[PDB]
């Protein structure tokens, strides 16, 4: 897709992640864990809620009858009415189809971008202490315990703490 993450370099979604739209899985000496990212999840949901507020709406225009259900109106004006109503319906049908197709394209690509923006944030946090896997993971070149992993998730990981030794581990 447009931003290359969802249905892209991230191979698939996680059905087990039920408390958010985006998030983290990790591996260290203490074992494995999972945690949703609130901020990215809420950014995507808020944007979709905005579309719904816009779209799930009718006009407040009052329309009255120009066609009799139970009797015959003048044939000339009736044909004009039929032409007019059918033309109006073709326009709204076209508009409805275009609206939803365009919005769906954007929703999908917006969601893709929010994944990439989270990925990019973490990359910049880790700086020279980690390398990209190519499938959405970062291989961290120092011991990173649960509090260290938490520091990455909550955006307080300080790269300079581990830099000296991380660089040596990378160069080997």
């Amino acid at each position: 897709g447009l931003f290359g993450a969802i249905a892209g370099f991230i191979e698939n979604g996680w059905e087990g992640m039920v408390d958010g739209w985006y998030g983290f899985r990790h591996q260290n000496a203490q074992g494995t864990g999972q945690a949703a990212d609130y901020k990215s999840t809420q950014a995507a949901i808020d944007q979709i809620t905005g579309k719904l507020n816009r779209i799930i709406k009718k006009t407040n225009t009052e329309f009255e009858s120009i066609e009799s259900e139970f009797s015959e109106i003048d044939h000339q004006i009736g044909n004009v009415i039929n032409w007019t109503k059918d033309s109006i319906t073709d326009i709204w049908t076209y508009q409805a189809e275009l609206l939803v197709a365009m919005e769906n394209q954007h929703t999908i690509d917006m969601a893709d971008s929010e994944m990439l923006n989270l990925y990019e944030r973490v990359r910049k946090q880790l700086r020279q202490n980690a390398e990209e896997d190519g499938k959405g993971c970062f291989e961290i070149y120092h011991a990173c315990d649960d509090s260290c992993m938490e520091s990455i998730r909550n955006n307080t990981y300080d790269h300079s703490q581990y830099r000296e030794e991380a660089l040596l581990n990378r160069l080997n």
Partner: protein, 320 residues
């Protein structure tokens, strides 16, 4: 032996298909419908001072056809017309009928005002017919009077009747013209003289002459009573000059304010509210579009030629 942190997204077992600009079969985690395809087979009338006319046709309210005896006056914000409703008891029709029906269906009520029309002793103003049954038997349109010669065969006298609108709003005046079944019948009711009915206000004028040419029986009657109508403005008069054939107004109508006319076969429901109606009932949906019918009235979703249009409410679904 490097530790790692992996970025990922959610997915669901039951994905749903939407259309995009580039893909007809795009699976997403969640979607929601934008086209309403279900209706309530009921007229939702909560919060509406409504009138269900039943078998009474709107025009029958003005002339007072027996079927409309309970709807001769009223107030409403919503007027409901039903299929096969009765406007006429005696054979005939209204000139400019649809415009009259629509005008009644745009109103918020009807009031009635006496013309006070009086007639000489040689006129019988209580003419009735078997076609218009009320209570015991032979009756007539409640708001009109069938004028005939008291003495059978005698010339109906030259008569003048004028109605002034003494109100501050326009009044709707209706009258009829009787077209007899034969020359003999015409002579019996109105005499041998040439008949002429002239009507005139500041803004309206017309002449009517009863026709007697052979025509088939409608419920055993070859006679016809056709109706004509016009609006008389505040302070204006309408004069009827006639010598036989006029079906004269006893009362005139005043259409009160405005209201929503609905033509529907669906039964009433005072439990639910609605702003959008059609032949088959009410449309209460929040959705922008609707596939029930192109004929609706009120504040409605727009009709589209589509059963379903799903709006994605989530990312691409990518299962393992």
């Amino acid at each position: 032996d490097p530790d790692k942190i992996c970025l990922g997204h959610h997915a669901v077992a039951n994905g749903t298909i939407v259309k995009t600009l580039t893909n007809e079969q795009e699976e997403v985690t969640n979607a929601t419908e934008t086209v309403e395809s279900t209706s309530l087979n009921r007229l939702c009338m909560k919060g509406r001072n409504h009138k269900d006319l039943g078998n009474c046709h709107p025009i029958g309210m003005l002339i007072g056809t027996p079927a409309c005896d309970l709807h001769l006056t009223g107030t409403w914000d919503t007027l409901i017309e039903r299929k096969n409703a009765i406007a006429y008891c005696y054979p005939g029709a209204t000139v400019n009928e649809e415009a009259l029906r629509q005008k009644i269906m745009e109103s918020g009520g009807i009031s009635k005002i006496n013309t006070g029309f009086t007639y000489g002793s040689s006129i019988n103003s209580a003419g009735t017919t078997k076609a218009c049954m009320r209570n015991g038997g032979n009756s007539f349109y409640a708001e009109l009077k069938w004028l005939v010669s008291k003495n059978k065969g005698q010339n109906f006298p030259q008569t003048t009747n004028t109605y002034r609108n003494a109100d501050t709003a326009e009044h709707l005046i209706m009258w009829g013209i009787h077209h007899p079944s034969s020359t003999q019948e015409k002579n019996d009711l109105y005499g041998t003289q040439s008949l002429s009915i002239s009507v005139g206000s500041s803004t309206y004028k017309n002449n009517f002459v009863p026709v007697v040419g052979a025509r088939p029986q409608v419920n055993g009657l070859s006679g016809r009573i056709d109706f004509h109508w016009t609006l008389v403005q505040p302070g204006d008069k309408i004069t009827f000059s006639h010598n036989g054939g006029l079906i004269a107004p006893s009362r005139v109508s005043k259409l009160i304010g405005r209201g929503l006319g609905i033509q529907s076969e669906a039964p009433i429901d005072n439990s639910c509210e609605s702003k959008c109606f059609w032949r088959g009932g009410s449309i209460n949906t929040r959705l922008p579009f609707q596939n029930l019918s192109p004929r609706t009235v009120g504040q409605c979703p727009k009709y589209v030629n589509k059963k379903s249009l799903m709006l994605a409410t989530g990312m691409r679904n990518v299962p393992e």
